[PDB]
Amino acid sequence: AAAAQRCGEQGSNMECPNNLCCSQYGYCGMGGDYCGKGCQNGACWT
């Protein structure tokens, strides 16, 4: 779906799943903006 797309605290406390990294601004993806230092949830590198 395209509704309720955000994650973490911006995402109404609904996280991305099983690996998918949640950026500091509340967006699901992979790499240094999502899995890097700002990570809220998912497979973070910390």
UniProtKB/Swiss-Prot annotation:
<feature type="binding site">
    <location>
        <begin position="14"/>
        <end position="16"/>
    </location>
    <ligand>
        <name>substrate</name>
    </ligand>
</feature>
<feature type="disulfide bond">
    <location>
        <begin position="16"/>
        <end position="28"/>
    </location>
</feature>
<feature type="disulfide bond">
    <location>
        <begin position="21"/>
        <end position="35"/>
    </location>
</feature>
<feature type="modified residue" description="Pyrrolidone carboxylic acid">
    <location>
        <position position="5"/>
    </location>
</feature>
<comment type="subunit">
    <text>Homodimer, u-shaped.</text>
</comment>
<feature type="disulfide bond">
    <location>
        <begin position="39"/>
        <end position="44"/>
    </location>
</feature>
<feature type="disulfide bond">
    <location>
        <begin position="7"/>
        <end position="22"/>
    </location>
</feature>
<comment type="function">
    <text>N-acetyl-D-glucosamine / N-acetyl-D-neuraminic acid binding lectin.</text>
</comment>
<feature type="domain" description="Chitin-binding type-1 1">
    <location>
        <begin position="5"/>
        <end position="46"/>
    </location>
</feature>
<protein>
    <recommendedName>
        <fullName>Agglutinin isolectin 1</fullName>
    </recommendedName>
</protein>
